[PDB]
C-alpha cells in the first residue's frame, strides 16, 4: 500500500511549496490522480484476498472503501474554496493538511491487516476531524459537537482496546489472516459476553447505533462542509467495516447478543427517519437520514448471512456519495443565504434551473429509486432480514414509505413553491458548485451498470 | 556576549561602570511647563543620554527602521482625537492613556538598560511615576469611568515594582493661568481646546500625590516659570545633591543583575500591560486583531526576526 | 540569587536525587532525600512573597513527615534482619511506612493535598523541577522494593490518585494547578503497573516528563500562568498554539501522538495477569484528564478569544527567553509512537 | 460597543468583478486553471478511463472461470451417470466420527 | 454569516477563581496577576 | 523484642500523632517533628548497640546532624512566615486554594 501511502504524504510538501494562488488548483489535481491509481487495487480475486505484505493487505471490503475514500479528497477541495477565501494563507494550508492526514489514516486503516494496527489509525481520525470541527466550523455549537463527537469514540473505542489485547494474549496474534483460521467458538459465559460488547460498542457508536447517535447531529451539522462530506461518507463507514471484520472471532454468541441491537436498529429506523419530517434546520434532516439509513447496515451485518453482507457493503458505498452530495446542495444555499433553516428560501427552482435537477436526483437516491445501488443494497438487507424473520418486512416497509415522505419534502420545501421575495442575492450557480454535484451523482449512477465491484467480500 | 549570566560571572558587573555621575533625572512637569527645553538642556550640560518625551510612535523608534507605523498598529488611539472628543464612545481616552503608560514603562526599561550597561546617565521627560497625573485629570473631567481607573491601577501595581525610582526629580511649576497663555501662543488647533479644568487636575495631582510621594525616596528640585530657564542653575543645583535616600542606596551587583535582565527583555517588561481584563476602551475584538496582525507582518522588516529579513537586504541567512 | 550559587544549588538537587539512585545502603537513600530537599526551598523561595513563603513551607512540613516515616521504616527493618540493603524490606510493617513515605513525597492521592498548592505559589520554573525532576528518587526506591509492596495498598493509592487528579483539574482555571492535578493522574498509572512489570514505570515516566517539561517551557517562554493569559497567546506567537495542541492531545493518551504508549502498554501488562477490569477503569477514567486538556486547546488553539490593545505592542519584539530544548522535547512529546518498541533499552 | 470589534463584512459577489468567474478563485487565470484541473481530471481521466478500465477487468473474482470450470463437471458427471452434485463436500471415507 | 468567534462573556467564563461556581468558593478571587500580595 | 522497644516505639507514635494535629502554633508542630527524631535516634542507638554493630555506631551521629540541618531550615521558614504576618499561626498560611 506503499504506492498509496507515499504520494498522500506528498501532497503536503505540494500544498506547502507551492505559489500563493495554486494551492487549491495542485492539491485537486495530484488528489484526482492518486484516486486514478486507486483502481489498481481491483485486482480481486475469488478465492484469496491482495496480501501485499506483513501490514497492509486488502480484499473485496476495503478496496470500495479505499477508491470512496481517496476520490472525497479533491471534492472536499472543491466544496471548501469558497468559504475559505477570506482566509489566511498558511491557515488555508493547515486545513488542506488536515484533510491530507485524514485520507492518510483512512487509507492505511481499511488496509491494516493487524488488529491492532487498525486500532490505533482507526483512532487517529478523530485527531484531524476534531480539529476540523473546532477550528473551521462556524457557529459557538462546534465547540460542544467536538467533545459529544471525541468523548463518544473514546467511551467505547477504550475497552476495544482491552478486548483487542486480550485477544492477542490468548489467541496470540491479531493479524487478521491469522485469526480466520485460528478462531475459536465463543462459549457462552458472563467474561465472553462483555468481550463481546467491547469488541463491538466502538464500532456501533461510530455508525452509529439508536440511543448512542446524539454525537451525530452536532458533529455532522456544526461542522465545515469538507468536515461534514468525510464525517458522513467515509467515517461512519469505519464502524460498519470493523463489525465485519471483528464479528468473526464472535461466533457463535452473536446470534443471541445481537437481539438488542437489532431491535434498536429496526425502532431507530423508523425513529429518525421520522424526526426527519419534523426538521428545521435542512443540514440536521440529512444528518438524521444518515443514521436511518446506517441502521439497515447495523442489522445487516449482525444477521451475518451472504445476501446481508451484500447489501451491507452497497449501502455503505452507495450512502457515501449520496449523503455527502446532499451536503454540498445544503451548502450551496447557505452559502447565498448564510442561513441552514429549510424554511427560509423557497422555490429555488424558478431561480436555479440546474441545480434544482441535482435535488431531483440526489433526492432520488436517497429514497431508494431502482436500479441505483442505494436501492440494490436496500434491496438485499431486507431480503436477508425477511429470511431472519418475516415480521422484519412491516418494519422495513414503514420506512420506506417514510423515507420517500422525507426526502421529497425536502425538496419540495426549498425548490418548489413561491420565491421568498426578500431574499434577492440568488446568484447564478457556478461551475464549481455544478461540477462538484456531478462529480457525487455520475459515479454513483455508473455504478449501476456494474454493481459487482461494491458487493464485497461474499459476492 | 550578549548579556546573562556568564556575562555576569564573567566580568560584566553593574558597579564597575556606574560612577558619581551615574544618575536618572525626569524632568516633570505640567503642559507647555517649558520641561522639553529644560531637560534637553540639562542632558547636554553633564553629559547624559536624552530621551524625548515618550509619546504614541514612541515603540516604533526603538524597533524596526526607526520611523513611525501607521496607527492602526498603534491602536488608532490620537492625542489630537482625545481634545476634541474627550468623551468618546469608542474609548479613545482611556485606550490613549494606557498605551501611553506601555510606552512609558518601556521608555523606562530602555533608559535603566542605557544607565547599566554603560555606566552613563539618562534625562526623562516625563515617567511611569508621574504618568498617572493624566488618569485622574482624565477622570475628575469625566473623561473616562472608574473601571478605566481601576484597570490602569492593577497594570501599575505589577509594573512599578520591579523598577528603581529616579535619582533626582526636577519639576518646572507653571499656574494654570500661565500654561493657557503659553498653550495659546503655540496655536495648536486641537490643545487649544484644552480646558482649565483639565490642567488644574494635572497640577493637582502633581502637587497632591506625585511630589509628596516622590520627596521620600528622591531629590525633588521645584523650580519656577522663571528659575527654570537659568540651566546653569539647574546643572549647579543636581550635582550638589547628597542622595542620603531611596532604594538605590541598597542595591548591589546581584540586584542590579536581575533588573538588568529584566529591562533587557522587553516582552517580559510589557508582559502584564495586557492583563486579560475585559475593559471595552483596551479589549479588541479577535477577528479585528487578527486582520491587523497579518497586516503588521507584511510591513517591511517585519515578516521575521531582525537580521532574517531577505527583503530589506538581509544576507547569509543559510548560515545564520 | 548570585547565578554561581544558583548552578550550585541545583546541582545539589541533583547530587541528592543521584545518590539515592546510586546508593545500596538506606541511610544514603535517606540523606539524598536530605539533601534534595534541602537545596529545592531556596529556589521554591526566589521571588520572595507570601505565596512563595506558604508553598515552602507547606512543601517542608510534607517532606520532612516522609522523610521520618522512611527511617522508621528502615530501622524497623534493621530491627527484623539486621542490614542496611537497599532490596525488599523483611518486615510487613516497614513495607507500608516506606510506602506511605514514598506516597507523600510523589503526592499521590490522599497524600496530594500539597502538590495543587505548592505548584501554584512558586515560579514555573520551580513548578517543573517539582513535578518531573522530585519524582526521580521516589521511583527509583520503589522500583527496588515493589516484591514486598502491599498489592492492595499500591492499587489503592494508584487508583485514587487517577481519580482525584481526573477529577481535580476539572475546576481549575490556573495552569500551574492545572499541571499539579495532571500529575496526580499520570502517578497513579506509573504505580498501577509496578508490581506487574516495573519497565513500563520507567516508560511512563520518561514520557511524562517529556512530555510535562515541554508544558512548561511553552508556559514560560510567554510567561503565561492563567488560561485567559495564555488565550492571548495566539495573538503573538501563533507557532506556540500549535505546538500546545499537539503536546496537549498526547498528554490526554490519543493516537497517534507519544502519551499513547505508556497506557499502551500498562495495558498490555496488566492484562497479561490476568487484569481487565483495573486497566478498563483507568483507561476510562483517564477521560476526565482529556477533558481540561482539550479545554485549554480550545481557548489556545482552536479558537481566537478577546486581545488587548496593549497587545500591539509585543508584536514588535521577539522572544528571547531560551526556550531549552523545546524544539527536541516537543517532536519527542508527540512523534516518538512509531518506535515504541524502543522501550526494551529500559529493560 | 463591549469592545472594538470589526463590522460583519459583507458577502462579495464573484460576478461583479467577473461575469465569465467558474468560481474557483478570484484570479481569472487561476479561476480557468482550476476548471481545467477538474474537469480533465475528474471527467476525461477519472470517470471515462476508470469508467472503461472497470469494464475490462481481468475476471474480477473469476465469475467466467466459475460458469466454465462448471460447464465441464456438468458434462463430465452427466456423460458418467455421476450425480450433478453431491450431498456431501467432503469424502466421508476420511471422517472419524466421534464415538 | 463570519465564523464566530469568543466574545467576552464567553471569556470571562474561563476568569474566576473556580470553574464550576458553588456557594462554598463564591468567596474566592482570583490570584494576584504577579503572585504578589500587598505586605500587611 | 523487649519492653524498652515498646515504649520508644511508643514515643514515636506520639509523636508522629502529635505532628500530624496541629493546634495553632507552627512551632509546636516543629518540636513534634524533633521528638520524633530523638525516638529515632534512641531506636536506632538501642539495635546498633546491643547487637554490637560496630560500623553502624556512627549511624546515630549522622542521623542527628542532617535532621538537626533540616530543622535549622525549619525555623528559617517559621521566621520567614512571623515576618509576613506577625504570628507563627498555620492558619495564616491558607493563601493557596483559601
Ligand atoms: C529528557 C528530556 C527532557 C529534558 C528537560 C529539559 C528542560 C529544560 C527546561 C527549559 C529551561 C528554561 O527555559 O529555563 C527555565 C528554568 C530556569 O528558571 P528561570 O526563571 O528561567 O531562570 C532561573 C534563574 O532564576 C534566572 O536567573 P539567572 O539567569 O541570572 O541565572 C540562572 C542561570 C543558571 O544557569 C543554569 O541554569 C545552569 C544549570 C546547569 C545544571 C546542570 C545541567 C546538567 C549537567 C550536570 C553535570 O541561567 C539558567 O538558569 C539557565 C536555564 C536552565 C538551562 C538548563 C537546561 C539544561 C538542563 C536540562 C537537562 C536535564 C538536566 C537536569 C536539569 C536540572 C535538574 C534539577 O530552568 C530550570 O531551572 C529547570 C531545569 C529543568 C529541570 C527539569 C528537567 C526535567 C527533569 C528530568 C531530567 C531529564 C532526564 C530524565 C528524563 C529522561
Ligand atoms: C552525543 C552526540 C549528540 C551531539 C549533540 C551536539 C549538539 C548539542 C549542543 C548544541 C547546543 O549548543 O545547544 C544545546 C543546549 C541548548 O541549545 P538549544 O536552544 O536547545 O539549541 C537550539 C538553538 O537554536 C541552538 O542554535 P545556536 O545558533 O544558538 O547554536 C548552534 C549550535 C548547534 O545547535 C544545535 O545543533 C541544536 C540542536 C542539536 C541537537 C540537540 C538535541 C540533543 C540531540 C540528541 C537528542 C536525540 C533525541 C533522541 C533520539 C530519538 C530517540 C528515538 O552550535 C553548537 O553549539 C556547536 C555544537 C557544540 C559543539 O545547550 C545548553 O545550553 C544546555 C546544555
Ligand atoms: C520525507 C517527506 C517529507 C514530507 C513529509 C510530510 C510532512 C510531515 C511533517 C510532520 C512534522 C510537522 C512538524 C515539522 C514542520 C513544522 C515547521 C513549521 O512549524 O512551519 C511550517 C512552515 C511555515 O512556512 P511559512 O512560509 O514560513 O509560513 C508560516 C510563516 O512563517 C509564519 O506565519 P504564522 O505565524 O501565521 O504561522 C503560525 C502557524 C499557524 O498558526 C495558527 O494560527 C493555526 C492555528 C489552527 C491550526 C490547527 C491545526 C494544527 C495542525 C497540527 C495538529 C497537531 C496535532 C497533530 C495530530 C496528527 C494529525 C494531524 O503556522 C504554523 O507554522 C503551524 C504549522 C506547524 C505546526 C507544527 C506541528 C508540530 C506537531 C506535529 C505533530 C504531528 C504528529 C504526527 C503523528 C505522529 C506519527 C508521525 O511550512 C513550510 O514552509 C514547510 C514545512 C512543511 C511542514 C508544514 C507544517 C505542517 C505540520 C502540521 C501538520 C501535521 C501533519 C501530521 C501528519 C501525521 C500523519 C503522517
Ligand atoms: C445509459 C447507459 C446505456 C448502456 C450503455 C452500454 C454500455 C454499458 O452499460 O456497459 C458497459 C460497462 C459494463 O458492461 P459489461 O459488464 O456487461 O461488459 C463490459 C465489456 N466486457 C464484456 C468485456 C466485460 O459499464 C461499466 O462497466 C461501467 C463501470 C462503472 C465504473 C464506475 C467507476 C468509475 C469512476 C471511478 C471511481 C471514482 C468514483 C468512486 C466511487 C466509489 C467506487 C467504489
Ligand atoms: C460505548 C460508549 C457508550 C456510552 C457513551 C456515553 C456518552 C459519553 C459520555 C458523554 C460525553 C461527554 C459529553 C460532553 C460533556 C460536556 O461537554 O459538558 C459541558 C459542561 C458545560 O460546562 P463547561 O463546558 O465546562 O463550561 C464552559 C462552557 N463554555 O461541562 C461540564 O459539566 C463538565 C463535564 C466534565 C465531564 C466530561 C468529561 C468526561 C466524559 C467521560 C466521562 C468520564 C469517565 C467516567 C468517570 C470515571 C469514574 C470516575
Ligand atoms: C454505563 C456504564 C456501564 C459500564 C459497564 C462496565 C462492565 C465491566 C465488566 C467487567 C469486565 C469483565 C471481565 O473481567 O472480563 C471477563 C474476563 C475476566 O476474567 P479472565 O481472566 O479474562 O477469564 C478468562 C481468562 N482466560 O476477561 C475476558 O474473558 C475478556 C474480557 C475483556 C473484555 C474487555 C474488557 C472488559 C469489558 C469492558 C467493558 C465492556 C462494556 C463496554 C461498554 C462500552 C461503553
Ligand atoms: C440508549 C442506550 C442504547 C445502548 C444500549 C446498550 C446496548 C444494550 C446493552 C447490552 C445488553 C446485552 C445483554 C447482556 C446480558 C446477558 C445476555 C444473555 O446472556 O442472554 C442469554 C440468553 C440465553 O440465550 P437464548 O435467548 O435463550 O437462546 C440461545 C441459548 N443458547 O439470551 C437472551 O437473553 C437474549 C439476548 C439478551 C436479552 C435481550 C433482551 C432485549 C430487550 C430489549 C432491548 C432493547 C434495547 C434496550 C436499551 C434501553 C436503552
Ligand atoms: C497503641 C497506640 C499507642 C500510641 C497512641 C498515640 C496517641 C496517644 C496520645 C498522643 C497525644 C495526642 C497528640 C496531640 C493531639 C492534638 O494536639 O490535637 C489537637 C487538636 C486541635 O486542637 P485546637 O487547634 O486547639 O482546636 C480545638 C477546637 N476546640 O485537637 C483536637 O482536634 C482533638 C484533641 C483530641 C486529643 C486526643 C488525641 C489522641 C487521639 C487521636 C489519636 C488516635 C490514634
Ligand atoms: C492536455 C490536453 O488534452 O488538453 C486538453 C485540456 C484543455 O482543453 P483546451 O484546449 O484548453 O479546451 C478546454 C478548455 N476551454 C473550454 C476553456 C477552452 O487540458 C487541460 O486543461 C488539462 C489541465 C492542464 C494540465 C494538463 C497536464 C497533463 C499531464
Ligand atoms: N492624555 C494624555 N496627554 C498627554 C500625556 N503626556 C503628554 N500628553 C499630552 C498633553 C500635551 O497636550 C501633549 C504635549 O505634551 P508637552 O508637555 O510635552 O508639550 P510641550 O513640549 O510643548 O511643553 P514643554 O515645554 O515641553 O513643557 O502631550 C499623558 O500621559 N496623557
Ligand atoms: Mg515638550
Ligand atoms: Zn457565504
Known amino acids: 500500500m506503499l504506492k498509496y501511502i507515499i504520494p498522500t504524504i506528498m501532497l503536503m510538501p505540494l500544498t506547502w511549496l507551492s505559489k500563493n494562488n495554486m494551492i487549491w488548483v495542485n492539491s485537486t489535481a495530484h488528489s484526482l490522480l492518486i484516486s486514478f491509481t486507486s483502481l489498481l487495487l481491483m485486482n480481486q480475486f475469488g478465492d484469496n484476498s491482495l496480501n501485499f505484505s506483513l501490514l497492509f493487505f486488502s480484499d473485496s471490503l476495503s478496496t470500495p472503501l479505499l477508491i470512496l475514500t481517496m476520490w472525497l479528497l479533491p471534492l472536499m477541495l472543491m466544496a471548501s474554496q469558497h468559504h475559505l477565501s477570506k482566509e489566511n494563507l498558511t491557515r488555508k494550508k493547515l486545513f488542506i493538511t488536515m484533510l491530507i492526514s485524514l485520507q492518510l489514516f483512512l487509507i492505511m486503516t481499511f488496509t491494516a491487516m493487524e488488529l491492532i494496527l487498525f486500532y490505533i489509525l482507526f483512532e487517529a481520525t478523530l485527531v484531524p476531524t476534531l480539529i476540523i470541527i473546532t477550528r473551521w466550523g462556524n457557529q459557538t455549537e462546534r465547540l460542544n459537537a467536538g467533545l459529544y463527537f471525541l468523548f463518544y469514540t473514546l467511551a467505547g473505542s477504550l475497552p476495544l482496546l482491552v478486548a483487542l489485547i486480550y485477544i492477542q494474549n490468548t489467541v496470540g496474534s491479531l493479524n487478521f489472516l491469522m485469526l480466520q483460521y485460528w478462531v475459536q467458538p465463543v462459549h457462552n459465559s458472563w467474561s465472553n459476553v462483555f468481550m463481546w460488547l467491547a469488541c463491538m460498542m466502538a464500532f456501533m457508536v461510530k455508525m452509529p447505533l439508536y440511543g448512542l447517535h446524539l454525537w451525530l447531529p452536532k458533529a455532522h451539522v456544526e461542522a465545515p462542509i469538507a468536515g461534514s462530506m468525510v464525517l458522513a461518507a467515509v467515517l461512519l463507514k469505519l464502524g460498519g467495516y470493523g463489525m465485519l471484520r471483528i464479528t468473526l472471532i464472535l461466533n457463535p454468541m452473536t446470534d443471541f447478543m445481537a437481539y438488542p441491537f437489532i431491535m434498536l436498529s429496526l425502532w431507530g429506523m423508523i425513529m429518525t427517519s421520522s424526526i426527519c419530517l419534523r426538521q428545521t434546520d435542512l443540514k440536521s434532516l440529512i444528518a438524521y437520514s444518515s443514521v436511518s439509513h446506517m441502521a439497515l447496515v447495523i442489522v445487516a451485518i449482525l444477521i451475518q448471512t451472504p445476501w446481508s453482507y451484500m447489501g451491507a457493503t452497497a449501502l455503505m458505498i452507495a450512502h457515501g456519495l449520496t449523503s455527502s452530495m446532499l451536503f454540498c446542495l445544503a451548502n450551496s444555499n447557505y452559502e447565498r443565504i448564510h442561513s441552514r433553516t429549510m424554511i427560509l428560501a423557497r422555490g429555488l427552482q424558478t431561480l436555479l434551473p440546474l441545480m434544482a435537477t441535482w435535488w431531483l436526483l440526489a433526492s432520488l437516491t436517497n429514497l431508494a429509486l431502482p436500479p441505483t445501488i442505494n436501492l440494490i443494497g436496500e434491496l438485499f438487507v431486507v431480503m436477508s432480514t425477511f429470511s431472519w424473520s418475516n415480521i422484519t418486512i412491516i418494519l422495513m416497509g414503514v420506512n420506506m414509505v417514510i423515507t420517500a415522505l422525507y426526502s421529497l419534502y425536502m425538496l419540495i420545501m426549498t425548490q418548489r413553491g413561491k420565491y421568498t421575495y426578500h431574499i434577492n442575492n440568488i446568484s447564478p450557480s457556478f461551475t464549481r458548485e455544478n461540477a462538484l454535484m456531478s462529480l457525487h451523482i455520475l459515479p454513483l449512477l455508473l455504478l449501476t451498470l456494474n454493481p459487482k465491484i461494491i458487493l464485497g467480500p461474499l459476492y | 556576549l550578549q548579556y546573562g549570566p556568564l556575562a555576569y560571572i564573567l566580568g560584566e558587573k553593574a558597579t564597575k561602570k556606574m560612577t558619581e555621575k551615574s544618575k536618572l533625572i525626569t524632568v516633570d512637569g505640567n503642559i507647555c511647563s517649558g520641561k522639553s527645553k529644560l531637560a534637553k538642556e540639562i542632558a547636554e550640560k553633564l553629559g547624559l543620554k536624552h530621551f524625548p518625551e515618550a509619546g504614541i510612535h514612541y515603540v516604533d523608534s526603538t524597533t524596526g527602521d526607526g520611523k513611525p507605523l501607521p496607527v492602526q498598529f498603534s491602536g488608532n488611539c490620537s492625542l489630537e482625537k482625545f481634545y476634541d472628543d474627550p468623551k468618546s464612545n469608542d474609548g479613545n481616552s482611556y485606550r490613549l492613556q494606557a498605551w501611553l503608560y506601555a510606552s512609558r514603562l518601556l521608555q523606562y526599561a530602555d533608559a535603566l538598560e542605557h544607565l547599566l550597561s554603560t555606566g552613563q546617565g539618562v534625562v526623562l521627560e516625563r515617567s511611569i511615576y508621574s504618568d498617572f497625573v493624566f488618569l485622574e485629570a482624565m477622570y475628575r473631567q469625566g473623561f473616562i469611568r472608574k473601571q478605566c481607573v481601576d484597570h490602569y491601577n492593577q497594570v501599575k501595581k505589577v509594573t512599578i515594582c520591579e523598577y528603581l525610582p529616579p535619582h533626582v526629580v526636577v519639576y518646572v511649576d507653571v499656574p494654570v493661568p500661565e500654561v493657557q497663555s503659553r498653550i495659546q501662543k503655540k496655536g495648536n488647533p486641537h490643545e487649544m481646546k484644552i480646558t482649565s479644568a483639565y490642567l488644574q487636575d494635572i497640577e493637582n495631582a502633581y502637587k497632591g500625590t506625585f511630589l509628596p510621594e516622590m520627596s521620600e525616596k528622591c531629590e525633588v528640585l521645584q523650580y519656577s516659570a522663571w528659575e527654570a530657564q537659568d540651566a546653569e542653575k539647574v546643572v549647579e543645583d543636581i550635582e550638589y545633591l547628597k542622595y542620603d535616600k531611596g532604594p538605590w542606596l541598597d542595591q548591589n551587583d546581584r540586584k542590579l543583575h536581575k533588573l538588568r535582565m529584566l529591562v533587557q527583555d522587553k516582552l517580559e517588561v510589557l508582559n502584564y500591560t495586557s492583563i486579560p481584563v475585559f475593559l471595552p476602551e483596551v479589549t479588541v475584538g479577535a477577528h479585528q486583531s487578527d486582520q491587523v496582525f497579518q497586516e503588521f507582518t507584511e510591513l517591511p522588516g517585519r515578516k521575521y526576526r531582525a537580521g532574517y529579513n531577505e527583503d530589506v537586504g538581509d544576507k547569509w541567512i543559510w548560515l545564520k | 540569587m548570585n547565578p554561581i550559587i544558583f548552578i550550585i544549588i541545583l546541582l545539589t538537587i541533583m547530587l541528592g536525587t543521584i545518590i539515592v539512585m546510586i546508593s545500596s545502603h538506606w541511610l544514603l537513600v535517606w540523606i539524598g532525600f536530605e539533601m534534595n530537599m534541602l537545596a529545592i526551598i531556596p529556589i521554591m523561595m526566589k521571588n520572595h512573597n507570601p505565596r512563595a513563603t506558604e508553598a515552602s513551607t507547606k512543601y517542608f512540613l510534607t517532606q520532612s513527615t516522609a522523610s521520618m516515616l522512611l527511617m522508621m521504616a528502615v530501622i524497623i527493618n534493621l530491627m527484623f534482619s539486621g542490614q542496611w540493603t537497599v532490596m525488599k524490606l523483611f518486615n510487613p510493617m516497614a513495607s507500608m511506612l516506606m510506602t506511605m513515605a514514598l506516597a507523600m513525597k510523589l503526592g499521590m492521592a490522599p497524600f496530594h493535598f500539597w502538590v495543587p498548592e505548592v505548584t501554584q505559589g512558586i515560579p514555573l520554573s520551580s513548578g517543573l523541577i517539582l513535578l518531573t525532576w522530585q519524582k526521580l528518587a521516589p521511583m527509583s526506591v520503589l522500583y527496588q522494593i515493589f516484591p514486598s509492596i502491599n498489592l492492595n495498598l499500591i492499587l489503592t493509592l494508584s487508583v485514587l490518585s487517577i481519580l482525584i487528579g481526573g477529577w481535580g483539574g476539572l475546576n481549575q482555571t490556573q495552569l500551574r494547578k492545572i499541571m499539579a492535578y495532571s500529575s496526580i493522574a499520570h502517578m497513579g498509572w506509573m504505580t498501577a503497573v509496578l508490581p506487574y512489570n516495573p519497565t513500563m514505570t520507567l516508560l511512563n515516566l520518561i514520557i511524562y516528563i517529556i512530555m510535562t517539561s515541554t508544558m512548561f517551557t511553552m508556559f514560560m517562554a510567554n510567561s503565561t500562568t492563567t488560561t485567559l493569559s495564555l488565550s492571548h497567546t495566539w495573538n503573538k506567537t501563533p507557532i506556540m498554539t500549535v505546538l500546545i495542541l499537539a503536546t496537549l492531545l498526547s498528554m490526554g493518551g490519543l493516537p497517534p501522538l507519544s502519551g499513547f504508549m505508556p497506557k499502551w502498554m500498562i495495558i498490555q501488562e496488566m492484562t497479561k495477569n490476568n487484569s481487565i477490569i483495573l486497566p478498563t477503569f483507568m483507561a476510562i477514567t483517564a477521560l476526565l484528564n482529556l477533558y481540561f486538556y482539550m479545554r485549554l486547546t480550545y481557548s489556545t488553539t482552536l479558537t481566537m478569544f478577546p486581545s488587548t490593545n496593549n497587545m500591539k505592542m509585543k508584536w514588535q519584539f521577539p522572544l528571547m527567553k531560551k526556550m531549552t530544548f523545546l524544539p527536541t522535547m516537543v517532536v519527542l512529546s508527540t512523534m516518538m509512537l512509531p518506535l515504541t518498541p524502543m522501550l526494551s533499552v529500559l529493560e | 460597543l463591549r469592545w472594538q470589534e470589526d463590522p460583519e463584512p459583507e458577502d462579495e459577489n464573484l460576478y461583479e468583478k467577473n461575469p465569465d468567474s467558474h468560481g474557483y478563485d478570484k484570479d481569472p487565470a487561476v479561476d480557468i486553471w482550476n476548471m481545467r484541473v477538474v474537469f480533465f481530471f475528474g471527467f476525461s481521466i477519472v470517470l471515462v478511463l476508470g469508467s472503461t478500465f472497470v469494464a475490462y477487468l481481468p475476471d474480477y473474482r473469476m465469475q467466467e472461470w466459475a460458469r466454465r470450470e462448471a460447464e465441464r463437471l456438468v458434462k463430465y458427471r452427466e456423460a458418467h451417470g455421476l450425480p450433478i452434485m453431491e450431498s456431501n463436500c467432503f469424502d466421508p471415507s476420511k471422517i472419524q466420527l466421534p464415538e | 454569516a463570519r465564523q464566530w468567534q469568543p466574545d467576552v462573556e464567553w471569556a470571562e467564563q474561563y476568569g474566576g477563581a473556580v470553574m464550576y461556581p458553588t456557594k462554598e468558593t463564591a468567596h474566592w478571587k482570583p490570584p494576584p496577576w504577579n503572585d504578589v500580595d500587598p505586605p500587611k | ?98
Open chain 6, 1 to 98: 523484642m523487649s519492653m524498652v522497644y515498646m515504649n520508644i516505639m511508643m514515643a514515636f507514635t506520639v509523636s508522629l500523632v502529635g505532628l500530624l494535629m496541629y493546634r495553632s502554633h507552627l512551632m509546636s508542630s516543629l518540636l513534634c517533628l524533633e521528638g520524633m527524631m530523638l525516638s529515632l535516634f534512641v531506636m536506632a542507638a538501642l539495635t546498633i548497640l546491643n547487637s554490637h554493630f560496630t560500623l553502624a555506631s556512627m549511624m546515630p551521629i549522622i542521623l542527628l546532624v542532617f535532621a538537626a540541618c533540616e530543622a535549622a531550615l525549619g525555623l528559617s521558614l517559621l521566621v520567614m512566615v512571623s515576618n509576613t504576618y506577625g504570628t507563627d499561626y498555620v492558619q495564616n498560611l491558607n493563601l493557596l486554594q483559601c
